[PDB]
Amino acid sequence: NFRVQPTESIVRFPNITNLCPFGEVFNATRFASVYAWNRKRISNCVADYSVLYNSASFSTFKCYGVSPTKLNDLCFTNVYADSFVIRGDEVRQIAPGQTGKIADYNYKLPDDFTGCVIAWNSNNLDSKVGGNYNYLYRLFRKSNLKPFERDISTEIYQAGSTPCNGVEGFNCYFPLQSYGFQPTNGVGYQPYRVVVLSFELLHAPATVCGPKKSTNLVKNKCVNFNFNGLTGTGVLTESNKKFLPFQQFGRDIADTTDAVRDPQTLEILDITPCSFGGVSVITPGTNTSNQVAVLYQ
Amino acid sequence: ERDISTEIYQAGSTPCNGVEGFNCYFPLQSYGFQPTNGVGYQPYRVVVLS
Amino acid sequence: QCVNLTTRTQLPPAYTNSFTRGVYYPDKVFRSSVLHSTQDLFLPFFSNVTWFHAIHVTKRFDNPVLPFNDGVYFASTEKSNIIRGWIFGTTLDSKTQSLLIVNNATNVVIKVCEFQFCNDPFLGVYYHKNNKSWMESEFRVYSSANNCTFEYVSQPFLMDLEGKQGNFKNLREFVFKNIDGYFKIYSKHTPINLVRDLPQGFSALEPLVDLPIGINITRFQTLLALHRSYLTPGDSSSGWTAGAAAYYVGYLQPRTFLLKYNENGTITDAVDCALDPLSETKCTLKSFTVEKGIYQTS
């Protein structure tokens, strides 16, 4: 057979890439506490986690579960972004499969959590000298907090059974203390803006998946191309006829697919392979002639 | 085939391979066989005869 | 808010016939001079569908909650834009994610939230006396909203808010399909000029957009509108008006249709394969010029 193998493989699915508002939540004014995290819905946009891993601006980008370069290919349904400020040593507690005080009584995470936890150092975003009397946290609780559940209850923890008149005293501890965020401290009691991404997968179509790389424009080449699922190998020649301004593909009289519209330029292009026939040989006897002749069909 | 490569795996940025650093995990993980575990976490001597 | 209406005298609906209606493009692929047979939800020709009316000339204001079926061909002949939007859901009581696609004069708001729907929602248009204008003020659509899953603001579309008593001039063809949780809208506008029944023109509806809301739609209701005047007090009791609008409600059925394409990719003829014995023979033979000779059916 006389076939021509393709040399290039252009892939072009999108036309206008819009990055998700990731810098708005990161470079915001202020957040909240760990027991009352703010849930923000981030969807209807093309995510791109590759611009944040190579930025070299985060303090701890270690993510559990999957690899940091493999989550860009996996598609999700709805991504929830929760932000809270904690201490320096409390960053490792916010991880799937951990237990202690913050991950058991403040914000509990599931064991099989798909998303990871990222954070960065902050010394001017919400830090001040002289102490800190704004951020709070939870200490004890009657029952364990379920994952993905906010806590805004300011009740008094009843440890024992002695009557304390609802005030802090004997067997009546207050699980709402203030943090000691100070820039002159060591590895502990330091404000750290932690943002956890919740990766959820449902039956809804993908809309928050990673980016889709697109190649450059090229025509009049007998190479392979994948135009919106249509995998064809042929010469992308011009077309004098036009299609309707709502279609995408196009058939012909042979009940086959051979015409696709360019999604980057809205130009009708026909598909024409460069493989016709095989190789024919002509031998007018071996004992009478030692010369052959290649024949093309 | 057989390979006994004990190098550091590089994932994304920050190259390793000796220099270590961030995002540089050890591929060779320890099993941790203990008699106090279950039957599924016990070592099994598998002999394959080809 | 929720302002119910007073029990009034209504009129029984009529029964009209369809003349080649409910035909749209089954796929977004260009075709030319090809005859293919696919399985798509279409409308059977020469069928008796329900004919609803809403003319004030009396006090006709009917809007029942019919169960939503697989494919609904909504053909409304409005000359002054009386029907605003439509509602979709199952119970409609601030318990499930109901779909609300309203077409107000201000803009196109498509919100899929848990809207508390009243017993009989409508739209109130107040008539000002200081200036000859018609602006909408009463928004008795939903009581309140809680959580939301999809909110989109499209381009502003200006509509008419002056109810008249003339003949129809514009035809708004709409098709609502909820298959596998996906809502498909087929919007197509075409000016007409008639007073009753359906036009004999061919149906060629284009798909608008496909929003994967992923909800369960069971019942639906057509939201109408009401107008005010200086001669009436303006209360939502009995002293108001509703103009004149007649919309056709047709349910689609899974029938095999033979689509015909010309040299421009525009469907000009649709031959049904499950209606008349003469039309069933052309679908099997894949032709349109039946001459002499005996043929086989099934």
Side-chain angles (χ1 to χ4, degrees):
Chain A
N1 306 140
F2 207 51
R3 334 218 191 176
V4 176
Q5 303 309 121
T7 46
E8 296 181 25
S9 304
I10 50 170
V11 181
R12 310 178 201 171
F13 271 56
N15 192 31
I16 291 187
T17 36
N18 283 126
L19 296 168
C20 290
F22 286 129
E24 174 200 281
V25 196
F26 289 155
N27 311 342
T29 55
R30 51 162 288 124
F31 301 141
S33 296
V34 62
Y35 83 116
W37 36 267
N38 217 2
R39 164 168 285 194
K40 311 205 203 178
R41 173 166 184 177
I42 303 302
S43 45
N44 206 212
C45 59
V46 177
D48 198 0
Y49 306 105
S50 185
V51 302
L52 315 174
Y53 180 50
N54 296 9
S55 197
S57 288
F58 290 84
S59 176
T60 319
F61 221 88
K62 168 63 185 294
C63 283
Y64 280 152
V66 291
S67 311
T69 54
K70 288 177 59 61
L71 48 98
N72 284 87
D73 297 350
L74 183 53
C75 300
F76 318 120
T77 301
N78 203 11
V79 169
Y80 286 100
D82 316 324
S83 63
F84 40 81
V85 191
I86 43 174
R87 292 170 57 242
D89 284 309
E90 286 169 3
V91 180
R92 305 189 290 265
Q93 318 209 307
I94 318 288
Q98 284 275 355
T99 167
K101 171 71 57 167
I102 309 300
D104 275 350
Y105 300 118
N106 309 38
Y107 172 63
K108 188 156 196 70
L109 295 98
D111 287 12
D112 36 34
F113 198 29
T114 51
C116 70
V117 164
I118 54 170
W120 67 97
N121 192 213
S122 58
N123 282 355
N124 202 254
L125 258 298
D126 52 346
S127 206
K128 66 190 297 309
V129 287
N132 179 65
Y133 326 110
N134 301 306
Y135 293 90
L136 303 174
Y137 64 97
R138 194 55 167 233
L139 195 50
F140 300 116
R141 200 168 176 84
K142 305 284 174 64
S143 293
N144 298 36
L145 270 175
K146 294 164 173 51
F148 302 132
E149 174 172 64
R150 213 167 71 121
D151 198 3
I152 48 95
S153 51
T154 46
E155 69 188 84
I156 307 302
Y157 179 75
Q158 185 59 59
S161 206
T162 55
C164 63
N165 317 338
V167 85
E168 161 174 69
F170 189 50
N171 299 148
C172 285
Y173 303 115
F174 197 41
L176 282 161
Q177 297 109 318
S178 209
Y179 270 131
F181 293 146
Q182 274 206 259
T184 41
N185 290 4
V187 86
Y189 288 103
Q190 178 165 49
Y192 263 74
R193 298 166 88 85
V194 182
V195 172
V196 47
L197 299 180
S198 187
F199 290 155
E200 298 188 22
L201 284 101
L202 286 95
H203 304 283
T207 194
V208 78
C209 195
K212 194 62 164 78
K213 299 301 289 182
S214 180
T215 50
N216 323 98
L217 314 174
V218 61
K219 293 100 169 55
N220 311 107
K221 287 298 295 182
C222 191
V223 300
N224 186 29
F225 45 87
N226 179 35
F227 275 16
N228 317 88
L230 177 60
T231 302
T233 302
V235 177
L236 283 160
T237 194
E238 296 307 303
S239 191
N240 295 153
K241 64 197 170 68
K242 305 303 180 174
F243 293 158
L244 301 189
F246 89 104
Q247 302 169 331
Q248 177 54 244
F249 300 130
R251 310 202 87 171
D252 61 332
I253 208 54
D255 211 354
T256 193
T257 308
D258 35 22
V260 63
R261 168 185 292 200
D262 194 22
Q264 324 297 108
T265 333
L266 304 185
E267 195 184 80
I268 315 296
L269 299 161
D270 288 313
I271 304 171
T272 304
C274 58
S275 304
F276 299 91
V279 169
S280 289
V281 73
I282 293 151
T283 307
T286 317
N287 304 277
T288 42
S289 175
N290 301 353
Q291 197 178 119
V292 280
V294 191
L295 173 60
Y296 303 107
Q297 307 181 279
Chain B
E1 274 201 309
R2 186 196 310 190
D3 174 46
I4 43 178
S5 66
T6 66
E7 285 283 284
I8 318 293
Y9 172 60
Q10 181 194 309
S13 58
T14 317
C16 327
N17 314 111
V19 76
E20 292 273 353
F22 204 55
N23 303 132
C24 297
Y25 331 113
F26 210 47
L28 289 187
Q29 310 269 23
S30 288
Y31 276 101
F33 294 131
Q34 284 184 161
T36 39
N37 301 1
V39 200
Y41 305 104
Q42 273 167 31
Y44 264 74
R45 295 172 173 182
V46 194
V47 186
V48 173
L49 299 162
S50 171
Chain C
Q1 326 170 232
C2 290
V3 182
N4 295 320
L5 290 183
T6 307
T7 40
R8 67 267 172 181
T9 304
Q10 60 184 64
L11 309 180
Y15 279 111
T16 194
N17 200 88
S18 60
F19 303 95
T20 310
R21 314 294 315 153
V23 172
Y24 49 88
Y25 299 92
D27 44 356
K28 303 165 77 193
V29 183
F30 184 81
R31 287 185 177 274
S32 49
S33 300
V34 70
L35 305 180
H36 80 284
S37 290
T38 193
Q39 212 284 105
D40 186 37
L41 310 181
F42 279 119
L43 181 79
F45 296 153
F46 301 137
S47 308
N48 295 113
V49 295
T50 323
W51 192 8
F52 296 92
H53 303 259
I55 182 158
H56 184 73
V57 182
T58 189
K59 308 296 295 315
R60 169 72 177 273
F61 197 73
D62 285 352
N63 37 9
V65 200
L66 295 174
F68 179 76
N69 289 338
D70 309 300
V72 170
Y73 170 62
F74 200 91
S76 199
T77 77
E78 318 145 333
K79 70 261 182 171
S80 297
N81 306 332
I82 303 303
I83 291 102
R84 308 287 133 139
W86 304 271
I87 56 155
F88 300 96
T90 295
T91 72
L92 316 150
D93 52 347
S94 81
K95 298 198 183 276
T96 49
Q97 295 281 158
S98 299
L99 168 66
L100 170 62
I101 309 170
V102 68
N103 204 327
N104 211 9
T106 62
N107 247 102
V108 176
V109 174
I110 305 175
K111 283 173 72 168
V112 203
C113 318
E114 304 188 276
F115 295 117
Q116 174 64 48
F117 290 118
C118 329
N119 192 210
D120 181 39
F122 50 87
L123 270 312
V125 186
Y126 181 67
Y127 176 50
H128 298 254
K129 275 301 289 318
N130 62 297
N131 48 345
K132 300 298 147 296
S133 192
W134 302 81
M135 312 207 260
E136 180 185 290
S137 285
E138 304 204 44
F139 197 62
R140 314 295 168 256
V141 176
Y142 55 93
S143 175
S144 67
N146 199 5
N147 320 111
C148 286
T149 59
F150 172 69
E151 182 175 1
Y152 175 53
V153 188
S154 179
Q155 289 318 109
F157 192 86
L158 278 91
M159 74 194 307
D160 187 27
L161 302 102
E162 175 164 41
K164 314 172 182 176
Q165 280 309 306
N167 50 285
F168 322 116
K169 290 300 198 178
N170 191 43
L171 167 62
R172 289 208 184 156
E173 288 151 338
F174 286 101
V175 162
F176 303 124
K177 298 198 281 177
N178 187 254
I179 36 179
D180 305 357
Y182 307 134
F183 200 73
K184 297 171 52 64
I185 316 166
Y186 282 75
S187 71
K188 176 58 70 178
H189 297 73
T190 291
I192 53 158
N193 185 240
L194 51 101
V195 288
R196 64 176 299 220
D197 299 9
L198 279 157
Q200 312 304 107
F202 199 76
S203 188
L205 322 174
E206 289 191 315
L208 182 56
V209 83
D210 184 25
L211 303 158
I213 53 174
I215 70 175
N216 194 12
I217 295 174
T218 304
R219 302 184 190 97
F220 80 108
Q221 192 187 333
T222 302
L223 256 49
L224 313 178
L226 295 178
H227 302 291
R228 265 73 165 119
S229 55
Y230 62 97
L231 289 179
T232 47
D235 42 2
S236 317
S237 293
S238 43
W240 37 260
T241 178
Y247 48 90
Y248 309 95
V249 181
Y251 299 103
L252 309 178
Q253 289 180 107
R255 296 302 183 272
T256 297
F257 263 81
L258 173 63
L259 276 311
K260 173 204 282 175
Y261 289 83
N262 55 351
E263 70 273 300
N264 308 115
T266 294
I267 300 164
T268 38
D269 191 19
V271 168
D272 200 6
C273 317
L275 187 54
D276 303 328
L278 185 65
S279 184
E280 275 172 55
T281 317
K282 295 190 171 176
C283 186
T284 305
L285 293 178
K286 308 284 283 195
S287 51
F288 308 105
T289 60
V290 172
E291 298 312 297
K292 303 303 194 150
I294 194 165
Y295 305 120
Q296 277 313 295
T297 323
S298 297

